[PDB]
Amino acid sequence: IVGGYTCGANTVPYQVSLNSGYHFCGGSLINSQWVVSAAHCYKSGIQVRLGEDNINVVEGNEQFISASKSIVHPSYNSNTLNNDIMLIKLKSAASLNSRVASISLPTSCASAGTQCLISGWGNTKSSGTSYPDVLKCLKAPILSDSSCKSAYPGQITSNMFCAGYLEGGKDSCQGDSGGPVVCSGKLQGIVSWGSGCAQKNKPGVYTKVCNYVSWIKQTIASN
Protein backbone atom coordinates (compact mmCIF):
# COMPACT_ATOMS: atom_id res chain seq x y z
CA ILE A 1 0.00 0.00 0.00
CA VAL A 2 1.32 3.45 -0.99
CA GLY A 3 0.08 6.53 0.89
CA GLY A 4 -2.08 4.69 3.44
CA TYR A 5 -1.75 4.15 7.22
CA THR A 6 -1.06 1.46 9.84
CA CYS A 7 -4.34 -0.39 10.25
CA GLY A 8 -3.83 -1.43 13.88
CA ALA A 9 -3.49 -5.05 15.06
CA ASN A 10 -6.22 -7.35 13.82
CA THR A 11 -8.51 -4.45 12.78
CA VAL A 12 -8.96 -6.15 9.34
CA PRO A 13 -9.64 -9.67 10.59
CA TYR A 14 -10.50 -11.25 7.20
CA GLN A 15 -7.10 -10.23 5.84
CA VAL A 16 -4.69 -13.13 5.34
CA SER A 17 -1.12 -13.40 4.12
CA LEU A 18 -0.16 -16.06 1.56
CA ASN A 19 3.30 -17.39 2.35
CA SER A 20 5.80 -19.54 0.41
CA GLY A 21 8.75 -19.05 2.81
CA TYR A 22 7.98 -15.31 2.51
CA HIS A 23 4.86 -13.12 2.18
CA PHE A 24 3.92 -12.99 -1.55
CA CYS A 25 0.21 -12.04 -1.68
CA GLY A 26 -2.88 -11.20 0.43
CA GLY A 27 -6.23 -13.01 0.44
CA SER A 28 -9.61 -12.62 2.18
CA LEU A 29 -11.15 -15.21 4.50
CA ILE A 30 -14.76 -15.83 3.38
CA ASN A 31 -15.61 -18.77 5.69
CA SER A 32 -13.66 -20.92 8.16
CA GLN A 33 -12.21 -23.10 5.37
CA TRP A 34 -11.94 -20.87 2.24
CA VAL A 35 -9.96 -17.79 1.22
CA VAL A 36 -10.44 -15.65 -1.90
CA SER A 37 -7.35 -14.30 -3.65
CA ALA A 38 -6.11 -13.45 -7.18
CA ALA A 39 -5.46 -16.19 -9.75
CA HIS A 40 -2.12 -14.51 -10.57
CA CYS A 41 -1.09 -15.37 -6.97
CA TYR A 42 -1.37 -19.11 -7.73
CA LYS A 43 1.49 -21.39 -6.72
CA SER A 44 1.84 -24.81 -5.19
CA GLY A 45 2.59 -25.19 -1.44
CA ILE A 46 0.79 -22.10 -0.10
CA GLN A 47 0.68 -21.53 3.62
CA VAL A 48 -2.15 -19.23 4.70
CA ARG A 49 -1.41 -17.03 7.72
CA LEU A 50 -4.51 -15.67 9.44
CA GLY A 51 -4.63 -13.31 12.43
CA GLU A 52 -1.43 -11.54 11.32
CA ASP A 53 -0.37 -7.98 12.12
CA ASN A 54 3.44 -7.97 12.12
CA ILE A 55 4.24 -10.77 9.58
CA ASN A 56 7.78 -11.04 10.95
CA VAL A 57 7.13 -11.60 14.72
CA VAL A 58 4.87 -14.26 16.34
CA GLU A 59 2.72 -11.97 18.49
CA GLY A 60 -0.07 -14.37 19.28
CA ASN A 61 -3.35 -14.53 17.28
CA GLU A 62 -1.66 -16.15 14.24
CA GLN A 63 -3.10 -19.30 12.72
CA PHE A 64 -0.86 -20.94 10.02
CA ILE A 65 -2.83 -23.40 7.89
CA SER A 66 -1.60 -25.10 4.69
CA ALA A 67 -3.73 -24.74 1.59
CA SER A 68 -5.22 -28.15 0.73
CA LYS A 69 -6.59 -26.85 -2.62
CA SER A 70 -5.87 -23.73 -4.75
CA ILE A 71 -8.50 -23.26 -7.47
CA VAL A 72 -7.86 -20.68 -10.23
CA HIS A 73 -10.93 -19.54 -12.17
CA PRO A 74 -11.05 -21.71 -15.36
CA SER A 75 -11.31 -18.65 -17.64
CA TYR A 76 -8.44 -16.83 -15.98
CA ASN A 77 -6.25 -15.32 -18.73
CA SER A 78 -2.74 -14.40 -17.59
CA ASN A 79 -2.10 -12.10 -20.56
CA THR A 80 -5.09 -9.85 -19.79
CA LEU A 81 -5.77 -10.60 -16.10
CA ASN A 82 -9.42 -11.23 -16.96
CA ASN A 83 -11.11 -13.39 -14.29
CA ASP A 84 -8.29 -12.78 -11.83
CA ILE A 85 -9.71 -14.78 -8.96
CA MET A 86 -8.63 -17.87 -7.09
CA LEU A 87 -10.21 -19.87 -4.26
CA ILE A 88 -8.02 -21.53 -1.64
CA LYS A 89 -9.33 -24.31 0.61
CA LEU A 90 -7.57 -24.63 3.97
CA LYS A 91 -6.39 -28.03 5.14
CA SER A 92 -8.21 -27.52 8.43
CA ALA A 93 -10.86 -24.99 9.42
CA ALA A 94 -9.48 -21.81 10.96
CA SER A 95 -10.88 -20.88 14.38
CA LEU A 96 -12.97 -17.73 14.09
CA ASN A 97 -13.09 -15.06 16.82
CA SER A 98 -12.85 -11.22 16.79
CA ARG A 99 -9.26 -11.27 15.42
CA VAL A 100 -9.89 -13.89 12.72
CA ALA A 101 -13.24 -13.51 10.98
CA SER A 102 -14.84 -13.96 7.57
CA ILE A 103 -15.87 -11.09 5.29
CA SER A 104 -19.27 -11.29 3.61
CA LEU A 105 -19.61 -11.59 -0.16
CA PRO A 106 -21.63 -8.97 -2.03
CA THR A 107 -25.32 -9.41 -2.73
CA SER A 108 -25.06 -6.64 -5.38
CA CYS A 109 -22.26 -4.77 -7.19
CA ALA A 110 -20.98 -1.52 -5.71
CA SER A 111 -21.33 1.83 -7.45
CA ALA A 112 -18.85 4.45 -8.57
CA GLY A 113 -17.87 6.79 -5.73
CA THR A 114 -18.45 4.24 -2.94
CA GLN A 115 -15.63 4.35 -0.36
CA CYS A 116 -13.77 1.12 0.31
CA LEU A 117 -10.94 -0.24 2.47
CA ILE A 118 -7.93 -1.83 0.72
CA SER A 119 -5.15 -3.41 2.78
CA GLY A 120 -2.03 -5.53 2.59
CA TRP A 121 1.67 -5.94 3.36
CA GLY A 122 2.78 -4.84 -0.09
CA ASN A 123 5.28 -2.20 -1.22
CA THR A 124 4.76 1.15 0.53
CA LYS A 125 6.68 3.15 -2.13
CA SER A 126 5.81 4.47 -5.60
CA SER A 127 9.49 4.64 -6.53
CA GLY A 128 11.80 1.88 -5.23
CA THR A 129 10.75 -0.71 -2.66
CA SER A 130 9.96 -0.91 1.06
CA TYR A 131 7.95 -3.77 2.62
CA PRO A 132 6.26 -3.15 5.95
CA ASP A 133 6.14 -5.44 8.96
CA VAL A 134 2.58 -4.47 9.94
CA LEU A 135 -0.62 -4.42 7.86
CA LYS A 136 -1.25 -1.17 5.96
CA CYS A 137 -4.63 0.24 4.98
CA LEU A 138 -5.98 2.75 2.47
CA LYS A 139 -9.47 4.22 2.06
CA ALA A 140 -10.27 4.68 -1.65
CA PRO A 141 -13.35 5.24 -3.81
CA ILE A 142 -14.50 3.16 -6.77
CA LEU A 143 -14.04 5.20 -9.95
CA SER A 144 -16.52 5.43 -12.81
CA ASP A 145 -16.13 2.74 -15.47
CA SER A 146 -15.63 5.49 -18.09
CA SER A 147 -12.73 7.00 -16.17
CA CYS A 148 -11.40 3.48 -15.53
CA LYS A 149 -11.45 2.77 -19.26
CA SER A 150 -9.99 6.13 -20.29
CA ALA A 151 -7.06 5.48 -17.96
CA TYR A 152 -6.41 1.97 -19.43
CA PRO A 153 -7.78 1.90 -22.96
CA GLY A 154 -8.91 -1.56 -24.12
CA GLN A 155 -7.56 -3.30 -20.98
CA ILE A 156 -10.62 -2.99 -18.75
CA THR A 157 -13.10 -5.87 -18.91
CA SER A 158 -16.52 -6.14 -17.28
CA ASN A 159 -14.82 -8.29 -14.56
CA MET A 160 -12.67 -5.35 -13.44
CA PHE A 161 -13.11 -1.98 -11.75
CA CYS A 162 -10.76 0.84 -10.91
CA ALA A 163 -10.42 2.35 -7.44
CA GLY A 164 -8.13 4.99 -5.99
CA TYR A 165 -6.97 8.47 -6.84
CA LEU A 166 -6.20 9.73 -10.39
CA GLU A 167 -3.79 11.38 -8.26
CA GLY A 168 -0.56 9.77 -7.72
CA GLY A 169 0.24 9.06 -4.13
CA LYS A 170 -2.30 6.54 -2.82
CA ASP A 171 -2.76 3.03 -4.21
CA SER A 172 -2.25 -0.67 -3.66
CA CYS A 173 0.97 -2.20 -5.04
CA GLN A 174 3.04 -5.36 -5.45
CA GLY A 175 2.71 -7.68 -2.45
CA ASP A 176 -0.86 -6.42 -1.85
CA SER A 177 -2.04 -8.55 -4.83
CA GLY A 178 -4.86 -10.96 -4.05
CA GLY A 179 -5.90 -8.88 -1.05
CA PRO A 180 -9.24 -7.32 -0.23
CA VAL A 181 -11.20 -4.28 -1.33
CA VAL A 182 -14.09 -4.08 1.22
CA CYS A 183 -16.96 -1.60 0.73
CA SER A 184 -19.78 -1.21 3.24
CA GLY A 185 -18.78 -4.55 4.79
CA LYS A 186 -18.75 -6.56 1.57
CA LEU A 187 -15.79 -8.03 -0.35
CA GLN A 188 -16.24 -6.18 -3.65
CA GLY A 189 -12.70 -6.34 -5.09
CA ILE A 190 -9.44 -8.27 -5.25
CA VAL A 191 -6.14 -6.35 -5.68
CA SER A 192 -5.24 -7.34 -9.26
CA TRP A 193 -3.04 -4.92 -11.23
CA GLY A 194 -2.07 -1.37 -12.22
CA SER A 195 0.67 0.46 -14.15
CA GLY A 196 3.39 1.08 -11.56
CA CYS A 197 1.95 2.05 -8.15
CA ALA A 198 0.36 5.36 -7.11
CA GLN A 199 1.16 6.99 -10.46
CA LYS A 200 -0.84 9.91 -11.81
CA ASN A 201 -3.81 8.77 -13.97
CA LYS A 202 -3.07 5.05 -13.44
CA PRO A 203 -5.37 3.94 -10.62
CA GLY A 204 -5.56 0.46 -9.12
CA VAL A 205 -7.52 -2.18 -11.09
CA TYR A 206 -9.45 -4.80 -9.05
CA THR A 207 -11.25 -8.05 -9.83
CA LYS A 208 -15.04 -7.43 -9.67
CA VAL A 209 -16.09 -9.92 -7.02
CA CYS A 210 -19.86 -9.33 -7.41
CA ASN A 211 -19.64 -11.15 -10.79
CA TYR A 212 -18.25 -14.30 -9.14
CA VAL A 213 -20.58 -14.94 -6.23
CA SER A 214 -22.42 -17.84 -7.83
CA TRP A 215 -19.13 -19.33 -9.05
CA ILE A 216 -17.59 -19.05 -5.55
CA LYS A 217 -20.64 -20.72 -3.94
CA GLN A 218 -20.81 -23.57 -6.45
CA THR A 219 -17.03 -24.12 -6.34
CA ILE A 220 -17.12 -24.30 -2.54
CA ALA A 221 -20.21 -26.57 -2.60
CA SER A 222 -18.43 -29.05 -4.88
CA ASN A 223 -15.08 -29.12 -3.07
Ligand SMILES: N=C(N)c1cccc(C(=O)N[C@@H](C(=O)N2CCC(C(=O)c3ccccc3)CC2)c2ccccc2)c1
Ligand atom coordinates in the same frame (compact mmCIF):
# COMPACT_ATOMS: atom_id res chain seq x y z
N1 LIG B 1 -0.84 -0.14 -8.77
C1 LIG B 1 -1.67 -1.12 -8.37
N2 LIG B 1 -2.83 -0.96 -7.70
C2 LIG B 1 -1.04 -2.47 -8.37
C3 LIG B 1 -1.50 -3.55 -7.60
C4 LIG B 1 -0.86 -4.79 -7.67
C5 LIG B 1 0.28 -4.98 -8.48
C6 LIG B 1 0.75 -3.88 -9.24
C7 LIG B 1 1.98 -4.05 -10.12
O1 LIG B 1 2.69 -5.03 -9.90
N3 LIG B 1 2.25 -3.07 -11.10
C8 LIG B 1 3.44 -3.25 -11.91
C9 LIG B 1 3.35 -2.62 -13.35
O2 LIG B 1 3.83 -1.55 -13.66
N4 LIG B 1 2.77 -3.49 -14.29
C10 LIG B 1 2.11 -2.87 -15.43
C11 LIG B 1 1.21 -3.73 -16.31
C12 LIG B 1 0.62 -4.98 -15.63
C13 LIG B 1 0.41 -6.03 -16.75
O3 LIG B 1 1.38 -6.64 -17.15
C14 LIG B 1 -0.97 -6.25 -17.28
C15 LIG B 1 -1.22 -7.41 -18.04
C16 LIG B 1 -2.50 -7.59 -18.53
C17 LIG B 1 -3.56 -6.70 -18.31
C18 LIG B 1 -3.30 -5.57 -17.55
C19 LIG B 1 -2.02 -5.35 -17.05
C20 LIG B 1 1.70 -5.71 -14.77
C21 LIG B 1 2.22 -4.73 -13.71
C22 LIG B 1 4.69 -2.65 -11.26
C23 LIG B 1 5.96 -2.90 -11.81
C24 LIG B 1 7.07 -2.33 -11.18
C25 LIG B 1 6.92 -1.51 -10.06
C26 LIG B 1 5.65 -1.26 -9.52
C27 LIG B 1 4.54 -1.83 -10.14
C28 LIG B 1 0.10 -2.64 -9.20
Ligand SMILES: [Ca+2]
Ligand atom coordinates in the same frame (compact mmCIF):
# COMPACT_ATOMS: atom_id res chain seq x y z
CA1 LIG C 1 2.84 -12.30 13.38
